[PDB]
Amino acid sequence: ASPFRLASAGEISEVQGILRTAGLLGPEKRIAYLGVLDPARGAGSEAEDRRFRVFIHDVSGARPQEVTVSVTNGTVISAVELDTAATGELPVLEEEFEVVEQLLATDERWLKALAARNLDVSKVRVAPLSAGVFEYAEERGRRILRGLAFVQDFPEDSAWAHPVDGLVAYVDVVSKEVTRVIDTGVFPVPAEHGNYTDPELTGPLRTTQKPISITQPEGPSFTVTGGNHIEWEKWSLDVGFDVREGVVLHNIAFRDGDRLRPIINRASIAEMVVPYGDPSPIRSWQNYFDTGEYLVGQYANSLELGCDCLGDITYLSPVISDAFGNPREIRNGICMHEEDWGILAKHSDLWSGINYTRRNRRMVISFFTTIGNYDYGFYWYLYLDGTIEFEAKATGVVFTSAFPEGGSDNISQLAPGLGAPFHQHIFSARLDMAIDGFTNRVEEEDVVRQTMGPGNERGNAFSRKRTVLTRESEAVREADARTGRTWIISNPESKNRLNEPVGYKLHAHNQPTLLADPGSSIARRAAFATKDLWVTRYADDERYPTGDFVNQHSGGAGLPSYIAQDRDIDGQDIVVWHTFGLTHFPRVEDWPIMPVDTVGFKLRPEGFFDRSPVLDVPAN
Amino acid sequence: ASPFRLASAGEISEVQGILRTAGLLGPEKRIAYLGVLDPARGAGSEAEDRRFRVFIHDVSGARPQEVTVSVTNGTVISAVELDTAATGELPVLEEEFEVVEQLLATDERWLKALAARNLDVSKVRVAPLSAGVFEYAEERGRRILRGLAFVQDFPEDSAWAHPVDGLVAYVDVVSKEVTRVIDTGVFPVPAEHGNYTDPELTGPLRTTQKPISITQPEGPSFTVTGGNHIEWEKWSLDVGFDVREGVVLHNIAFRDGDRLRPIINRASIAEMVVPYGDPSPIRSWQNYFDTGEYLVGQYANSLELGCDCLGDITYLSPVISDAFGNPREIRNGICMHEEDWGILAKHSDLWSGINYTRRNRRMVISFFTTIGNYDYGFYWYLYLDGTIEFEAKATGVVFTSAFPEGGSDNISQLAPGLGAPFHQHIFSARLDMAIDGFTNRVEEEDVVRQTMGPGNERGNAFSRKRTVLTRESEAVREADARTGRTWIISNPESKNRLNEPVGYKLHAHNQPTLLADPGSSIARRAAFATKDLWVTRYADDERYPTGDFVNQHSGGAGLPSYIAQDRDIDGQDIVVWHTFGLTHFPRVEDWPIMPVDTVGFKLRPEGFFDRSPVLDVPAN
Ligand SMILES: [Cu+2]
Ligand SMILES: [Cu+2]
Secondary structure: OOOOOOOOHHHHHHHHHHHHHOOOOOOOEEEEEEEEEOOOOOOOOOOOOOEEEEEEEEOOOOOOEEEEEEOOOOEEEEEEEOOHHHHOOOOOOHHHHHHHHHHHHOOHHHHHHHHHOOOOHHHEEEEEEEOOOOOOHHHOOOOEEEEEEEEOOOOOOOHHHOEEEEEEEEEEOOOOEEEEEEEOOOOOOOOOOOOOOOHHHHOOOOOOOOOOEEEOOOOOOOEEEOOOEEEEOOEEEEEEEEOOOEEEEEEEEEEEOOEEEEEEEEEEEEEEEEEEOOOOOOOOOOEEEHHHHHOOHHHEOOOOEOOOEOOOOEEEOOEEEOOOOOEEEOOOOEEEEEEEEEEEEEEEOOOOOOEEEEEEEEEEEEEEEEEOOEEEEEEEEEEOOOOEEEEEEEEEOOOOEEOOOOOOOOEEEEEOOEEEEOEEEEEEEEEEEOOOOOOEEEEEEEEEEOOOEOOEOOOOOEEEEEEEEOEHHHOEEOOOHHHOOEEEEEEEEEEOOOOOEEEEEEEEOOOOOOOOOOOOHHHHHOHHHHOOEEEEEOOOOOOOOOOOOOOOOOOOOOHHHHHOOOOEOOOEOEEEEEEEEEEEOOOHHHOOOEEEEEEEEEEEEOOOOOOOOOOOOOOO | OOOOOOOOHHHHHHHHHHHHHOOOOOOOEEEEEEEEOOOOOOOOOOOOOOEEEEEEEEOOOOOOEEEEEEOOOOEEEEEEEOOHHHHOOOOOOHHHHHHHHHHHHOOHHHHHHHHOOOOOHHHEEEEEEEOOOOOOHHHOOOOEEEEEEEEOOOOOOOHHHOEOOOEEEEEEOOOOEEEEEEEOOOOOOOOOOOOOOOHHHHOOOOOOOOOOEEEOOOOOOOEEEOOOEEEEOOEEEEEEEEOOOEEEEEEEEEEEOOEEEEEEEEEEEEEEEEEEOOOOOOOOOOEEEHHHHHOHHHHEOOOOEOOOEOOOOEEEOOEEEOOOOOEEEOOOOEEEEEEEEEEEEEEEOOOOOOEEEEEEEEEEEEEEEEEOOEEEEEEEEEEOOOOEEEEEEEEEOOOOEEOOOOOOOOEEEEEOOEEEEOEEEEEEEEEEEOOOOOOEEEEEEEEEEOOOEOOEOOOOOEEEEEEEOOEHHHOEEOOOHHHOOEEEEEEEEEEOOOOOEEEEEEEEOOOOOOOOOOOOHHHHHOHHHHOOEEEEEOOOOOOOOOOOOOOOOOOOOOHHHHHOOOOEOOOEOEEEEEEEEEEEOOOHHHOOOEEEEEEEEEEEEOOOOOOOOOOOOOOO
16 A cells, blocks of 8 residues: 555544544544645655644634644554644634624624615625734734625625725634724725626627537546556656645656656645735735635535546545544545647658657646635646646636725726735745655756857857755745746756756746735745745655744744755755746736636756657657 | 738739749749738728739849739839848748758868768768858858758768768859868767667657547537638637748737727737857857748648647648749648637635636647758637737757767757757747727836835735837837736727726746847847847838848848837837747757747737626536
8 A cells, every 4th residue: 555645534534533532622622734644754664654634723712732643553643732822823714714704793893884885784795814913912822814895795696796895804713702893984885796607797608619529539548546646658656635735746756768767756836825915904914825824625626527627537536624523525626637738749851851740748637726716726737758847727706895096006997996906826836856866956057148259259159057056045046037047956966878967947937926025924924935946955844835834923934944944955855945926917807707827837857868758659 | 802811823823924024034033032912001992902022033143133013913013123232132042952062062172071070972961051141251242051061871860960060161052152161170970860760769669648539529610711711709810821921810800799809910920030059160150040031931841630730620721932933832731720728717606606617718820840950830829818829839850069078068968979059949929919900009017016114004015017118219128027027008099998998918938038249140130039029110111020131131120220210109000029039958858859849928908808708608
C-alpha cells in the first residue's frame, strides 16, 4: 500500500474514534482542520505509520488544540493547546459563517440601519468574511467575522447585484455577540438584477453552437493504480487531496528510459490571497485567504461530465472530515484526463525530403472550488516534452459595492450605481523540489545585453548570466520581465551527457505582485505576495507561506519567518515558493457573471534530458 | 462580390497579361512580390476596383520597378523604377536561392576551404541566407546572399547536425559571382547525426498513446461565404492571404444585438525578425526578416488532416504568383475550425441555490510556414467572450554552429562539439484598429500603488492611471510588467450604456525586445523591434514596420520614418504595431528537433459591451 494514497472514509472515522476516546472531542469540540501527514524524510523506511493532523476548536471559548493521531496504531501522538492571540486563530468553521446573519437580524443597530434603507431584514443576506487584524485591541484572542449586506429580492435572485454599502458589522462568533455596527451613510442599493439565467437578461438563447465531441474509443492512455497513482507517457505521480490546499501532486517523476527520475517532490497551491484595494472603512479590511482561512478543498464542487470535464474522464472522489469527525466525500471532485495539445514538433526539410509532424498532448488533473461569490479552477498539466504547468481559472460573480457619485479611483462601475472594488487574486505555489533527487540549488538567470565594441564589432551579441542563491537571506527574488528573468532549479551532482547539471526552468507570467503599502497589515500577513519567488531549506513544519493559523494572525508568520533562519540552500533539500496573480479592475463584461480569466506559471526541462524526450512518439 | 475575397488564379493571370501588354513583363523580368491591395478608405466605394501591387525584378541587371495595376480596368495605375541602393532590394527570389550552392561548388577558394576540412563538395549543402547591410561597399546596389555550409552524409540525412564553422561565402545572385570566401579556421564538424526518424535514435516508438477522437456530428458552427467570409458566434470577418504576410484578417466585427460592430479593420503579422547573437564573423551578419526578405506566405505548407489540423477542418487554398506571373495554388494552406476551450463561466450560489456552468470555444484560423531549418505556425483565435488572440508557434530544427572548445557566452551546446547560437524570434503585429468605427485613440494604462496615510489609513488602496497618446511622437511605448502596463484602444465618440467610451485592452506577454546594441545595423533595420508598442495615423502607404523593401536595406524607412510625421492619433483612424518575441537560449531538449515554443498577445473587450456578451450561450 502506498503511503501517498488518499485518506479513507474509515480513516477519518478512525481519527474521530481515537479523538473522542482520548476525550479530545467532547460536545463543545469542533474539528477546524483535518488532514493526513505524508511520510517524513526516509528512503528504506517502511514503517507504515499513517498519521493525521487535526486542529480542534472549542465552541465554549476554551483554548483550541493541535493534535496528531496515528490511525495505524490508534494513538494520540501529540496534543497541544494553542494561544491563538499569539499564534493565530484556527480556520473558520462553516457553522460560524452561518450564525452571522442570524445574530445581526436581531441586533438593534443593524435593524436600525436596514430600516433607514427600507430593506426587509429577511431579504438581507450577509457575506460573513474573515476579519484579519486591525486596530481593535478587543479582538485579540477572539474569533471575529465581518459581515457585508446584499439584498436578495427572491429565493433565486442574485444578491450580489444589490450591495448595501455604507454598512459593515463585526461579530464575535463564540460568545455570539455583535461587537460593532458601522454605518457611514446610506448609498442607494443597485436596483438592476444580475440573474444571468433570466431570459429577460439573456435574451433568446443561441441555437448556433454545433457539438464538438471528444471521445477516446480505446479509453485513456494514463493508468490509475492504488486509487490515486498516475502513470502517463513517462510521467509518474500521486494525486493527493487536502481540505486546506485542495489537490496536491506528489512524487512527480519522469521515466527516462530505464530510470524513473524525480523532478518535484510535492506541488501545491499553499495559499491564495484576494486583497481589496477600496480604502472605504466598509471594505478596507477585506482580504480573503481562501486557502489559509476558508480552506479551498472543503468547498470543492462536484464536477459534472460533459459540463465541467469534457471527454474521457477519470474521477477521484476525495473524502474530508466534517466539523464533528465524520468523513464526507466530494463526489467527482477531481478530474483526470488527457487532451490534445496541437503540434508538438514539425519540420519539412528541403535537403532530406523528410516532412515530419507530431501532435502534443497534456495530462490534466483539476478541481473547482466556490468561495462565496467566486469560483476557482485549479489545473495542473503534464506535457509530453516534460513541461509541468499550473493554471488557475477565476470565474463567479464579482464582489460588489455601490458606485460612488462622482466616480472613484478604487472602484469601477459595472451597472447603474453598481460598483466593483479593485482587488487582486494572488496564488502561491509551493514546490518541494526533487530534481533527480533532493540535492538542489537555484539560479536566477537574466538576459545580458552587450555593448558594441572589441569582440562585438557589429553590436549583435547578447548573452545570459546565472546567479546562484546560496542562503535564504538572498532567496527572496523579484521579477524582471525586461531582462527575461527566469529561475533554474538544478542538481549540482547530477549531470547530463554534456557534463552539465540537469535542471528545470521556471517561467513566470510576471504579473504585478501585492500592491498594498508595505506597512499595511495585509503586506505583513501576506508578505509572500510581495515578491515573485522564494527559496527555503526544507523543513517538515514549514508547510504554508502564511503560516499554520492564518485567521487573525498579526503578521510576519510564514515565509518571512522561515527565511529569517538564513539556512544554506546551495545544493540542499529545497522548496520553491512562487507568487503569481491577477490584478482585477472589474469591467462591464465581467457582470452579471464573470467570464473566465487565468494566471499561472510552468517549468520546462533545461538540460535535464540528453536530447529531446519525445523522439519516440509515433506518427499517429 | 466582396472586395475582400482572395485573389484568384484568373486575376493573377490577368495581372500577368496586363503587365505583358504594358511591356513591363518581358523574358528577363521576374515577379519578386505580387498581392492584391485593400479597398481604399471611405464608404465612397464607386464599384469594384481590384488593384494589385507588383515588385518586378530584372535578371539582366536593369533597375527593378514597383507597379500597381487595376486588374478590373486592365490598366497600369503606376510603375516606377527603383534605385535599390537607396530604397532597398526586392525580396529574394526562390530561384536565387538555388544559385548559391551551385556557384560555390565551382569556386576554387571554396573548394580549397572544403578540402582543408576533408569534406566532399558533393555532400556540402549551403544555406543561402539574406545579406543585410554591413561594411561591404561593393554590395551596395547588388543582390547578395551569404552562404553557410552543412554536411549531409546521405540523401535522407539532416545536414543541420553537421555545421561547417569557420567558413562563409558571399555571392552576387544576378552577375553570378562569388564575391567573397571567408575562412577563419577549421573546426571539427559535429559527427552525430540528427535523424529524428532513425529507429536507432528514437528507440522503439511508444505504443502507449491511445486515440483522442475530435469530431463534429452536425458539422462546424461557422459559415464560409464568398470563399473567405467567416461568420461564427457573433463574429464576422474575411480571411485574406498575402504572399509576404501570410494569413491576414479583415473587417473583424462582432454582432451586438442588431448592430454589427467593427473591432479591427486589418490584422496581420507585418514583419518577423530572427536576429542572431553570436559575435563570430561567420554568423554576426545573420538576421532573418522572414516576412520582409523571404516572404512567409510563399513558403506556407500544405496542412494534412489528422496530422496538422485535427477535428472538423474547413480549408482555404490561397493562390500566389510564381516568379513569372503564373498563378500557383497552396493546397490546404489555411485551416479553419472551432475548438472547445474549457470553462467559459461557472458559479454555484449558496443563496440562490443556482449552479451555473458554461463551456467556452474558439474559432481558429492558421497556417504553418518553413523558412529553411525553422517552421512557424501562425494562429489567430476568436473567443465567445469577445477576446481576440494571436499565437506564434516556433518549431523545426535549430540553426547550428560548432561549440567552441572551452565554452561560449553566445552559443550553447546541444551535443558533443555541436553548438547553437543564441537568437530571437521577434514579430510585429500590425493592428489597423476600428473600435466601433475609425475614430479611435490609445491610452497606456498603468497600475498605481498608493501610500498609506490620509484617505488610505490602512494602506490597502491601489488605483490605475490612463495616459492618452495624442501625437505619434509620444506613441512609441515600452512594456512595464511590474506596473501591469497594458494599452487600451477606445472610440471616444462611442460610449457604452454607462457613458464610458467603448474599448479593447491589449495584453502583451512582456517578453524582452531586441537585444542588439542600439548602434548596430540590425537595431536600425529592425528598429520596430526595439519597442513594444507603436501607434501611427493610418496611411495607405504605411504597411510594414520595416518598409516595402527590407532586403539589404539600411535604416531610413519604416516606423521611425512614419512616426516623425507626428500626426494626430487622438480620435483618428489609427494603427497599432505590437512587437513581441521569444529569446531562444537553445537547450539540449531542442535537439535534434525543437518541440513547439510559443509567444503572442491578446485583446479583451474593455467596456465595449454593456454586460457580458455571453449570457445567451446555452447549457443544452
Ligand atoms: Cu477578481
Ligand atoms: Cu529559436
